[PDB]
């Protein structure tokens, strides 16, 4: 096949993407070895769904797992009556998700399970796939003429031909695997044919962070989780926390081989040690550096000029409320809290009004990084750690290091009950989630 | 007695004001005629209670009326567990109100019934009295050397030696009386002995407005409902709506007699007419002018200089929520609404957080003036009708003419359930009231 492995794409046809997927244990070849993973559509990652605004999506999920499951349409501003975080599809049963893709939407989104208490092992085992919303902006020459690829960043650990089981320490830290893969491949080679690449990036890992850097090159950020920036932003590196997406332009500068790496990053994961009268928690420290892929530049690369503008960011109404959500940890118990409470599906934590804007100040009073995710209602990050964000774009996950406060501008869109939670999915399963009702 | 009648004063003693009042039908002489009014303490108005910050008040109210009653400590930022708008004292029974006067407080406040559905006839019949909180500011020379008086502005109508009964039109408009009295006296004479007067003003009427003007003189506003201004404000006239208080300095300019008048004012009260195929509501138009009192200046008056400053207004924390409360009318039904609902004592309408600040936008979409009152939590009026307020001071009633929006900064103080309502008390009795819970 193509030197660069990417998930198969399923496109809407005549404004309709109608598809039946099965969630199923699937024997496959992965990183040179045979394993049984849990997959959608028989593959890992699952198929990439590619749609346009105003398309109808009709996705029937058949559950062929031995446990209940469901889907979260991560990042899509649709109704929580469709993207329903409380729905359970029992083993052997099916459910049809039907929705219209919002008019004002573009970017890279994804789908994965969200059945509380069961997310981490299901996601770890291979249940996820991408969803791309094509825009009219894709037709501008500076993007149209770029070579486009999706990079699904997901790690894995195998034991006895199956995903490794979660240990108690995994529930505390979030589970990371030794196989650090791109599109289910181990360090693939991307032999570029054009001098400008457009890369859609997805961190679909349970807990691993990717401090992205391409050797000898900057990256040009053109989209965040949920939409385009207003103009490209040059960065020397780009941190993607679990659940985050980004799109970047890469402008290949000369011929040669360039490593795309996940540089060392310390997200505050913990180990245990015993030093003569101890048995206490110790920092694992930064991750070991990983090579994600080999990028081979073409001969005599002459990249396109960058687009001067992308999408103007909407002018939001003045906010009508400020919320404060404080994240804390009980590491030895592997329990995680928002405002001193663990998740309770019966309890409503925040009640807001549709079509108003809120300011949410989310504060991490723990020692680990926590990537905070809100369903249904994409937000604008104003600042984090007291530092203003250098761009305007829609996001739906925001990373907070220890001690940091993020200030978010949150327009409330669809009515109904939905959730917010840490996207280190083990932490969500272990209680770090709350309920927002919009009326 | 003194040419100028003022209610008897009861003062705290050794930091304690301990007093038993009875609410009782009382034969008395009023405006030259004999009548039976409902009174506290056997008088109309009831006695003026005079206290200092940190005093203890212990007031036992004995109900000798044929209906239940209670007290509202109008304007006092105390607990709604004491100033309890839901408490009922049955006929023949007693209740003791005990509270400490807040440290940071000064001004003219008052007490009257607040038993929903029964306020208007009880207040109209004569149940009210003043409460004055003395401050250290009263010792400044420019105030100490002024001649001080309380003016309780309250009208009355008599029928068969008793307060006139409410008609259906009274429930629609709020009841006004033909006897327009000051301290229960008909057009008293105030023979000033000093050139500077300090007048504490209270509108304790059900519904009558007083567009105050002293002939040939401006007034110097030094306090609003719930505290001092930051410095005196010169005004040519001063409108006091039902429930409002003000304190003014008057600087007598020359010898002579000067009328203090209630000038014509149209608050939007309605009548009915039939003109050949009608039977429909017609504006009553402005009130007829009234003389409130005769002010006689002393010989060769040389008033004191005005104080340069009074009390700095507190710097409030940034607000965390904005509320919108819309007032509407159904005049022919004599029903009045807040956000489309009438009062229900079981229903909580707003839930806020103690020690935070809120912005309340109160909008009058009716045609009558409505004076909006909030219990427990004094507010700063920022603007009304889109016009910035010309001073900073604590208020607890704000008048809105037809169409006007008031923007208020509302620090939430004591925890508990309390109410907000129109202080045209007929409108409150007829539903224009809601419930705020502070937690
Ligand atoms: Cu997700
Ligand atoms: Cu977390
Ligand atoms: Cu979620
Ligand atoms: Cu009152
Ligand atoms: Cu009213
Ligand atoms: Cu009241």
Automatic annotation (TrEMBL), chains A, B:
Binding annotation for Cu(2+) 2: 74, 112, 423
Keywords tagged on the record: Metal-binding, Oxidoreductase
Amino-acid positions noted as binding Cu(2+) 3 in the UniProt annotation, renumbered to this chain: 114, 375, 421
Binding site for Cu(2+) 5: 370, 422, 427
Residues reported in the UniProt entry to bind Cu(2+) 4: 280
Domain Plastocyanin-like: 30-136, 172-263, 324-438
Residues binding Cu(2+) 6: 375, 421
EC number per UniProt: 1.10.3.2
GO molecular function: copper ion binding; hydroquinone:oxygen oxidoreductase activity
InterPro entries noted in UniProt: Cu-oxidase-like_N, Cu-oxidase_2nd, Cu-oxidase_C, Cu-oxidase_fam, Cu_oxidase_Cu_BS, Cupredoxin
Pfam families recorded: Cu-oxidase, Cu-oxidase_2, Cu-oxidase_3
PANTHER family attached to this UniProt entry: MULTI-COPPER OXIDASE, MULTICOPPER OXIDASE LPR1
Name the UniProt record assigns to this protein: Laccase
Organism of derivation: Thermus thermophilus (strain ATCC BAA-163 / DSM 7039 / HB27)
